[model samples]
Each structure stands twice: as C-alpha cells, then as structure tokens.
Target: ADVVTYENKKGNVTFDHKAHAEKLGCDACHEGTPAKIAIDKKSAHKDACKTCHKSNNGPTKCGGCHIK
Candidate 1:
C-alpha cells in the first residue's frame, strides 16, 4: 500500500491513501479535492473519510493502517 506522510503542530503521521481508497473508494478522498492533495489535512470530501467506513471501520490515526 502507498502512504503519504502528514506533519502538523501535534506531530507527524503517515496516511495510507491506497488503503483508504480500498476501504472508502477513490472518490471519497479524491473527488474534486485534487488540488487539496498538496495541502496536508485538507479533506477532499464533504464528510470525513471515517464517515463512509461504516462497514469495515477505517484507521483511527495516520499510522493506524499505514504503520510498517
């Protein structure tokens, strides 16, 4: 799986976009927020990715699934 790292004042973490896509579909995180990709913490969808994780329950943190 591919991972994108995100850093913030709180700390740094890796985000598994591929894993997210597998769980929530590409549109959930990509949609029209393509430009926002360059911006860390920018949500692509109106609702957070966790919202669609109704079935499998997505990662709780950046390293939740992206951990090596």
Candidate 2:
C-alpha cells in the first residue's frame, strides 16, 4: 500500500507514494480530482515529478527510481 510499482518498457519503478503524501499535499501534483498520475519522461523532465525531485534533490539518475 505504501509503494506503487510502475511497469515500464525501459525498467520497472517503485514509487514511495506514502512518503510523498506525507511531505506534500494532494494539490501539489493533482490537476483535477487527484486520480492516477500518468508519469512519463516528457512531463517528469519538463515539469512535474522530476521537476520537484530536482529541486528537492530526490533523484536524477535513471537507476534512482527505475529498478530491475
């Protein structure tokens, strides 16, 4: 329930949704009703998860999130 696993072509990722929820509010990322977040390199790099991660010093490397 804490970690959300995302399957990707490059590599699968395990997101610590619990940690983020505790650190940030729902509106921080959710645009509308706070449904499923569609993560992609395009948006993440430009502005969104990766954007915050960069500012917050989360992870930039590919292996940071994506795992085998």
Index of the highest-TM-score prediction: 2
Clashing pairs in 2: none
| Residue 22 displacement (Å), model 1 | 0.7
For residue 28, model 2's alpha carbon misses the true position, in angstroms, by 1.3
Badly placed stretches (over 4 Å) of model 1 are: 32-68
Total clashing pairs for each candidate: 0, 0
lDDT of each: 0.53, 0.67
Model 1: worst 10 consecutive residues (lDDT sum):
38-47
Ten contiguous residues minimizing lDDT sum, candidate 2? 49-58
Give the local distance difference test score of model 2.
Answer: 0.67
Clashes of 2: 0
Q: Give me the displacement of residue 35 in model 2, in angstroms.
A: 1.7
Q: TM-scores of all models?
A: 0.46, 0.63
TM-score of 1: 0.46
Clashing pairs in 1: none
